[PDB]
Design a protein. Structure first.
Length: 266
């Protein structure tokens, strides 16, 4: 019954999973009660028997390791509320930095047409679309991805400017390749031997982590375009062997996190 007593008991159950256990419980409780984080303030109570059990289930669920954000059915990325669920990779905060680089690149060059390969939750393409006049073409090998991205776009009023199709790389948009000014991706960059609550396709790029990159730069002619993709810490020197002329950016941590091929001409 006692709501805040409950919240303490659960915090402890998540100490080996998260440093911020209390916040996770507050979130879970809020969700289960179908309420806003910020209304959790009455200084007393507010939870019924069946609600109590549900919360305990979900704390159990999370206790094992199951990502928090599958349970919430939601994730903030760029201060926008993105839907997620099993089968969709959950946005990481580092990818924000990528979207912010992409947006300045747009302003600088007045870019109007942008692609997002492996859109996932739609988190990069929708953001770029939401915070600029660009239109975005997005792909993903996964059907869940594409349903979810279409919903997220629609959920942020950019359905008129964010188009998503199932397929690999830009095969479903051969018709638009010409016009694409900027290709964006947070692809799978993890080794096969760096070993999931999230889709395997989303994480790994073979025993190297580079399987995506090799295919991309082999298959596609990037002349006249700009490429900008997130990358694993370690792969800078090997990536320089896949593509030359490429630039590589440090992130907030001061670790290389993005490759940047600018082939946009004057
Ligand atoms: C690392 S997750 C990133 C999701 C999203 N870009 C983000 O950062 O939030 C990679 C995503 O790419 C998709 N994917 C992997 N390889 C792909 C490929 N060759 N073509 C299109 N999509 C791909 C997966 O479906 C997955 O959702």
């Amino acid at each position: 019954r006692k709501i805040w007593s409950l919240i303490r008991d659960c915090s402890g159950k998540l100490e080996g999973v998260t440093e911020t256990s209390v916040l996770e419980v507050l979130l879970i409780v809020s969700r289960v009660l179908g309420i806003r984080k910020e209304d959790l303030f009455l200084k007393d109570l507010g939870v019924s028997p069946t609600e109590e059990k549900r919360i305990l289930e979900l704390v159990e669920k999370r206790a094992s390791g199951y990502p928090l954000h599958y349970i919430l059915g939601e994730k903030e990325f760029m201060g926008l509320s993105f839907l997620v669920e099993e089968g969709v990779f959950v946005p990481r905060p580092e990818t924000e930095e990528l979207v912010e680089l992409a947006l300045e690149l747009i302003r600088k060059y007045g870019i109007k047409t942008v692609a997002d390969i492996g859109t996932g939750s739609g988190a990069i393409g929708v953001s770029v679309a939401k915070f600029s006049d660009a239109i975005v073409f997005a792909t993903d090998v996964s059907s869940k991805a594409v349903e979810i991205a279409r919903k997220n776009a629609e959920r942020h009023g950019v359905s008129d400017r964010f188009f998503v199709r199932k397929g690999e790389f830009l095969e479903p948009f051969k018709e638009k390749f010409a016009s694409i000014e900027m290709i964006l991706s947070n692809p799978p960059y993890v080794k096969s031997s760096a070993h999931l609550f999230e889709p395997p396709e989303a994480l790994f790029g073979g025993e190297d982590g580079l399987d995506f990159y090799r295919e991309f730069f082999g298959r596609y002619d990037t002349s006249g375009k700009i490429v900008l993709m997130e990358i694993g810490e370690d792969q800078v020197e090997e990536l320089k062997k896949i593509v030359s002329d490429t630039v590589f950016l440090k992130d907030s941590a001061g670790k290389y996190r993005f490759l940047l091929l600018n082939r946009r001409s004057s």
